[PDB]
Design a protein around this ligand. Structure first.
Ligand code: CA
Length: 119
């Protein structure tokens, strides 16, 4: 779920408040269309796509699915006790968190005008 995703971030990118990723570019956050403004936004476009794919599994709701994972000593691990839906969402979240860590944060791209720049 988002709570857990929030925690994955704070664990892979402790230097930042998860809030910095909650509304960035065209895909990080409520957004979900248009051209990604930079590599970090692309991290979120991939994440969104991943969620849409996951939504294909019956009863699978990626914002709300509570999965099993661990983050310690810099490593994120989606545990073996996850069903197809949990494993899939956890993997979406784990890959995005990792992408976030290695992506440059461009202050200019925070909270942009979606209706005007993400068509
Ligand atoms: Ca999104």
């Amino acid at each position: 779920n988002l709570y857990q995703f929030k925690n994955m971030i704070q664990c892979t990118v402790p230097s930042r408040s998860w809030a910095d990723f909650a509304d960035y570019g065209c895909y990080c956050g409520k957004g979900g269309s248009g051209t990604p403004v930079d590599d970090l936004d692309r991290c979120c476009q991939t994440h969104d796509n991943c969620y849409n794919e996951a939504e294909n599994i019956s009863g699978c709701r990626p914002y709300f699915k509570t999965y099993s994972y661990e983050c310690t000593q810099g490593t994120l691990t989606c545990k073996g006790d996850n069903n197809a839906c949990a494993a899939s969402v956890c993997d979406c979240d784990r890959l995005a968190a990792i992408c976030f860590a290695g992506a440059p944060y461009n202050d200019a791209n925070y909270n942009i005008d979606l209706k005007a720049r993400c068509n």
